Automatic annotation (TrEMBL), chain B:
It comes from Sus scrofa. The keyword Transcription regulation does not apply. The chain holds residues 61 to 300 of 306 of the full protein. The gene is MRPL2. Residues 117-238 form the Large ribosomal subunit protein uL2 C-terminal domain. GO terms for cellular component: mitochondrial inner membrane; mitochondrial large ribosomal subunit; nucleoplasm. Mg(2+) 1 binds at Y72. Its main location: mitochondrion. This is Large ribosomal subunit protein uL2m.
UniProtKB/TrEMBL annotation, chain C:
It comes from the Eukaryota. Belongs to the mitochondrion-specific ribosomal protein mL37 family. This is Large ribosomal subunit protein mL37. The lineage of its organism: Eukaryota, Metazoa, Chordata, Craniata, Vertebrata. The chain holds residues 30 to 106 of 423 of the full protein. It is found in: Mitochondrion. It comes from Sus scrofa.
TrEMBL record, chain D:
GO terms for biological process: translation. GO terms for molecular function: RNA binding; structural constituent of ribosome. The chain holds residues 40 to 291 of 304 of the full protein. It is found in: Mitochondrion. Belongs to the universal ribosomal protein uL1 family. This is Large ribosomal subunit protein uL1m. One of its GO terms (cellular component) is large ribosomal subunit. Keywords: Mitochondrion, Ribonucleoprotein, Ribosomal protein, Transit peptide.
UniProtKB/TrEMBL annotation, chain E:
It comes from Sus scrofa. One of its GO terms (molecular function) is structural constituent of ribosome. It is found in: Mitochondrion. One of its GO terms (cellular component) is mitochondrial large ribosomal subunit. This is Large ribosomal subunit protein bL9m. It comes from the Eukaryota. Residues 43-87 form the Ribosomal protein L9 domain. Residues 101-186 form the Large ribosomal subunit protein bL9m C-terminal domain. Residues 2-33 form the Large ribosomal subunit protein bL9m N-terminal domain. Belongs to the bacterial ribosomal protein bL9 family. Keywords: Mitochondrion, Ribonucleoprotein, Ribosomal protein, Transit peptide. The chain holds residues 53 to 254 of 268 of the full protein.
Length: 85, 240, 77, 164, 202
RNA sequence: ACGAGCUACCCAUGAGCAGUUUAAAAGAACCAACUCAUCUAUGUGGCAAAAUAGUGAGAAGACUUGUAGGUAGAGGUGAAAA
RNA sequence: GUUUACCAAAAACAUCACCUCUAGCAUUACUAGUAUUAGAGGCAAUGCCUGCCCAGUGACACCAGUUUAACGGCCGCGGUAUU
RNA sequence: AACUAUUCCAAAAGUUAAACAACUCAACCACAAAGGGAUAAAACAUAACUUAACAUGGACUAGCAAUUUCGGUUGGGGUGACC
RNA sequence: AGUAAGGUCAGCUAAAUAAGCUAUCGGGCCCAUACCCCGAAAAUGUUGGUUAUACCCUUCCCGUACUACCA
């Protein structure tokens, strides 16, 4: 959420502008839970999955501040309890 | 406040059902369509558009029904006729010359040579002759009749190619449809509905039309006699 | 065909379950302990109500085939 | 010089090429790039192909040269016809030019039965002859070479060492 | 994902304190959008040989969309993690020590697939006597089928051929997979004449 | 933020129109209840922040009317009088 | 018939009629309808009529072009039959 | 600007892929064709096309609409004139 | 009143390279006239200034045109 200048000129009109991420519908597979979740994911999330070399690695390596999703924390907590138990 | 639509009945019944007018107000409560409201109270008759509907799935063969009476329907501009067969009754749109004590045949068997076209029979477009007048056109198999239901409106079949029928709508626009769709042969009743003359302003209020607004709007560029080529044929056949 | 139901008039379907119930081997945290709604807590799923003692007026109507005189043959009255 | 032909010169330069026979004994020409480069091997192979595809021993080798006769300056140079007699003429020959001006020339070199050394000597003379039209060093004049016989396909000659 | 920066400078706060944000600090400008960049490729390790990609235990930099949709979900490939690479590298050592790979290279597998369904036209000219030898047969692969065949790889049925007919040729790639391709010896024709007579007419 | 208990329009649910003239319950005709408010005179801090007296137009319809619900100010509503 | 409740009740608006324009169709308006239908407008019953003009503008076609019951337009100077 | 509608590009999803204009003038071959006098390379280092419903970023057109002003002197202002 | 604005052969137009059409004058064709063919003549409203002139400006004159409003 923010403002912008038309024509990228300072002396121009000030305009309210909202930028929204492009959402995609994908289903992901987790080895720890062996269940498929249809989760609204973004292209950045998929890149982070490949960067961590695994969907479970992405959840278990990224901290809370990086994830910013209650579903992710519950997904981590479900798998974290699975390993400990 | 959100309102509730009066279309809450779930089971089909031949008896008239209660009807509540809208007046152009949407569910929110604001005017969306002007010039509607303040009409005479009306009751709605449950009209069965799907001509071919067996009573039970045990015997899917063609069945023949009998016409009891032809009544006047306040909702639509045509005349509906009560039709009974087996253990149920149905309200279907009457053709030009349907009367009491008449027998109507409903069938779907696509025969190779032909089938004689009667004034009330409903046959699939694959069996009708080339030069046949039809109404209550079914756009897709099993969807039901949607097109050509106004008073006096009749479409004419044009040709059947590669197992597909092409018809002419009342708007003189060709339409392509699978030949297995059910259609009714004839012209819709109340032919002289177009020739009816309204004698006074009050009769418009009785029908349920409110007078137009008095604001004087200068004509824009949209006005004027426009000559435009006919749009291309609309086809509902999904080519694989 | 043209079914005579209307989406708005028909009873709405139950809301989708929360994501917590989809995670295997994870006990959800619900507000059923405080017996009142609270935002941020998962919606409980309760078993169908089973009154120990049947009440004549307030019980659900018995099925038609439960009647002793129910017969498969269709008789016309 | 038009940009349309500049793209074509870029495309032909971008075609992959590898040296030597790959590890696989049998492989598709689609999968692996051109391999045959040596002039001496190419001339012997054409004579070999005459044995493999039994025909007359005498064959006119109509060499195809993908000469870069453009991109000297922003304005293209015009085609010409330089005539120079080869040291081993076959039984002054004009250097024809493409009708479509697609930067390829088809000029006969010598007969198949001629020795490889003489044919290679004729090839070197042709390289100097075609470059005589634009001897400037600003831009390359030869891109690819394809030596084909009457009953054989061309081979990607490693013409880069023979340019000077 | 969009990337923006503020038009107006923000005053500093160097003691680990949150800086003051004003209304004029909300004015952003789009400097770059991540979706418009030329996207890269994804390297994956194949756990099963693909029809057009590499073989079991190979490194392929396939397109990013393909890996996420058909390769990884179906198990044909796994992530090319540094720990994952050495497992296949160690796995290769066991087979190649005793020559037990029998998997061919990335192109080698495609050679087997193409040769499984192919027919070679061995055009010979009857004006001069011709005898078929493995060197001659390999020539027709390059011209007709576009196949480069090593002279020793071909194993003819050892029967001399002097007339047109139908025969069979044995083709072996890397000494591991043996392919028996049909052989069709017909009268030779000039491709310029052949394509004019048949392709142009029909 | 709060307002459609006045008013503009609409959705529900109710309730009124006697006599007279005509094959007529015909947006016909005479005239009350009823509803509007043409003309003039009183009134002008008045009985009244728009009324009283006389006189008028419609009065089986595009008519009056009770209860209750809906549309809210960058709008609602309007047989356009901004 | 309707309107400026509280200075204008009218020649204003509406109206039957005629005409132009936009749309081939499903679960909350239009509509539980389907071009003899439904919207966005003009002009005002009936009767006799509604002439000429696509250059400009607008719209359509989205190219040539086509449209005025679309906005709008619909001429000078000089001489000539005794006067 | 937002918003509604039209159109394009990008993102996204999917589909297919290894390619054609001789003519024998001599002359071999019983044919069908052949040889001498050309039978290359290449397709594109990916390319091409399709994509319903939703929907992101960047542009184009139109509708609707937003912000803000409308100079001065003048034998009172406007008009003419002047600075 | 103010402002705007024009004058060109007898007539009407286009250019300032003063042209084109018609009218007028002479001749031919026809029984005669007209049509038609051929040939000739003809002007920049006015004064002054525009290197010098003309299309320009200025003066004079004729005539054309708009506006003259709030109380
Ligand atoms: K009707
Ligand atoms: K209310
Ligand atoms: K009072
Ligand atoms: K009145
Ligand atoms: K026009
Ligand atoms: K004064
Ligand atoms: Mg209706
Ligand atoms: Mg109207
Ligand atoms: Mg009007
Ligand atoms: Mg400090
Ligand atoms: Mg109220
Ligand atoms: Mg009465
Ligand atoms: Mg009356
Ligand atoms: Mg009133
Ligand atoms: Mg009174
Ligand atoms: Mg009075
Ligand atoms: Mg009196
Ligand atoms: Mg009266
Ligand atoms: Mg009256
Ligand atoms: Mg409110
Ligand atoms: Mg408003
Ligand atoms: Mg009103
Ligand atoms: Mg007005
Ligand atoms: Mg006004
Ligand atoms: Mg009146
Ligand atoms: Mg008033
Ligand atoms: Mg009054
Ligand atoms: Mg008429
Ligand atoms: Mg009239
Ligand atoms: Mg009027
Ligand atoms: Mg009038
Ligand atoms: Mg007219
Ligand atoms: Mg035009
Ligand atoms: Mg955008
Ligand atoms: Mg501002
Ligand atoms: Mg001013
Ligand atoms: Mg002033
Ligand atoms: Mg003054
Ligand atoms: Mg002025």
């Amino acid at each position: 959420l923010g403002h912008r200048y038309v024509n990228n000129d300072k002396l121009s009109k000030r305009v309210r502008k909202v930028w929204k991420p492009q959402l995609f519908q994908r289903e992901l597979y987790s080895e720890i839970l062996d269940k498929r979740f249809t989760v609204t994911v973004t292209m950045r999330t998929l890149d982070l999955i490949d960067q961590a070399c695994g969907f479970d690695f992405y959840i278990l390596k990224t901290p809370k501040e990086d994830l910013c999703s209650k579903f992710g924390m519950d997904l981590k907590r479900g798998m974290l309890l699975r390993l400990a138990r | 406040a959100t309102s509730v639509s009066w279309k809450s009945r779930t089971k089909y019944t031949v008896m008239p059902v209660k009807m509540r007018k809208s007046g152009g107000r949407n569910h929110t409560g604001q005017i969306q369509v002007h010039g509607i409201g303040g009409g005479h109270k009306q009751r709605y008759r449950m009209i069965d558009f799907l001509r071919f509907r067996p009573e039970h799935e045990s015997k899917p063969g063609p069945f023949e029904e009998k016409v009891i009476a032809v009544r006047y329907d306040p909702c639509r501009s045509a005349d509906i006729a009560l039709v009974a067969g087996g253990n149920r009754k149905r309200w279907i749109i009457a053709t030009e010359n349907m009367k009491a004590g008449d027998t109507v045949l409903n069938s779907d068997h696509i025969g190779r040579m032909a089938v004689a076209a009667r004034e009330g029979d409903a046959h699939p477009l694959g069996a009708l002759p080339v030069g046949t007048l039809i109404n209550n056109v079914e756009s897709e198999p099993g969807r039901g009749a949607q097109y050509i239901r106004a008073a006096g409106t009749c479409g004419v079949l044009l040709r059947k190619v590669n197992g597909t029928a092409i018809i002419q709508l009342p708007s003189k626009r060709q339409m392509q449809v699978l030949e297995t769709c059910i259609a009714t042969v004839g012209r819709v009743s109340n032919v002289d509905h177009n020739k009816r003359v309204i004698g006074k302003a009050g009769r418009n209020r009785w029908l349920g039309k409110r007078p137009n607004s008095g604001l004087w709007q200068r004509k824009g560029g949209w006005a004027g006699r426009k000559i435009r080529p006919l749009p291309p044929m609309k086809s509902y056949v999904k080519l694989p | 065909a043209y079914e005579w139901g209307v989406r708005s008039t028909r009873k709405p379907e139950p809301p989708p379950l929360d994501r917590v119930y989809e995670i295997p081997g994870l006990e959800p945290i619900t507000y059923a302990g405080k017996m009142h709604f609270m935002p941020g807590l998962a919606r409980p799923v309760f078993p169908p109500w089973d009154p120990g003692w049947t009440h004549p007026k307030f019980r659900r109507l018995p099925p038609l085939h439960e009647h002793p005189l129910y017969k498969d043959q269709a008789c016309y009255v | 010089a038009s940009d349309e032909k500049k793209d074509d010169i870029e495309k032909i330069k971008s075609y992959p090429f590898m040296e030597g026979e790959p590890e696989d004994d049998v492989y598709l020409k689609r999968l692996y790039p051109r391999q045959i480069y040596e002039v001496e091997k190419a001339i012997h192979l054409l004579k070999k192909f005459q044995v493999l595809d039994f025909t007359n021993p005498n064959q006119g080798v109509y060499l195809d040269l993908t000469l870069d006769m453009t991109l000297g300056k922003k304005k293209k140079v015009e085609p010409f016809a330089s005539v120079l007699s080869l040291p081993y003429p076959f039984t002054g020959h004009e250097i024809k030019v493409d009708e479509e001006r697609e930067n390829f020339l088809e000029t006969k070199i010598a007969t198949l039965n001629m020795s490889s050394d003489q044919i290679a000597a004729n090839l070197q003379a042709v390289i100097n002859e075609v470059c005589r039209q634009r001897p400037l060093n600003l831009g390359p004049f030869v891109v690819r070479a394809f030596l084909r016989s009457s009953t054989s396909e061309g081979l990607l000659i490693k013409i880069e060492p023979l340019l000077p | 994902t969009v990337i923006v920066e503020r038009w107006w400078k923000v005053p500093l706060a160097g003691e680990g304190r949150k800086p003051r944000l004003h209304r004029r600090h909300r004015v952003y400008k789009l400097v770059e959008d991540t979706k418009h960049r030329p996207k890269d490729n994804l390297e994956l390790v194949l756990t099963q040989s693909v029809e057009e990609l590499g073989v079991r235990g190979d490194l392929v930099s396939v397109k990013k969309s393909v890996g996420r949709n058909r390769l990884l979900p179906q198990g044909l490939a796994v992530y090319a993690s540094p720990e994952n690479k050495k497992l296949f590298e160690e796995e290769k050592l066991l087979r190649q020590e005793g020559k037990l790979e029998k998997l061919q290279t990335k192109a080698g597998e495609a050679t087997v697939k193409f040769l499984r369904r192919c027919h070679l036209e061995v055009g010979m000219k009857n004006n001069v006597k011709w005898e078929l030898n493995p060197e001659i047969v390999a020539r027709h692969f390059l011209r007709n089928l576009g196949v480069v065949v090593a002279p020793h790889a071909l194993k003819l049925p050892e029967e001399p051929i002097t007339q047109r007919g139908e025969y069979w040729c044995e083709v072996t790639v890397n000494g591991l997979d043996t392919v028996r391709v049909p052989m069709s010896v017909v009268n030779f024709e000039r491709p310029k004449t052949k394509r004019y007579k048949y392709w142009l007419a029909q």
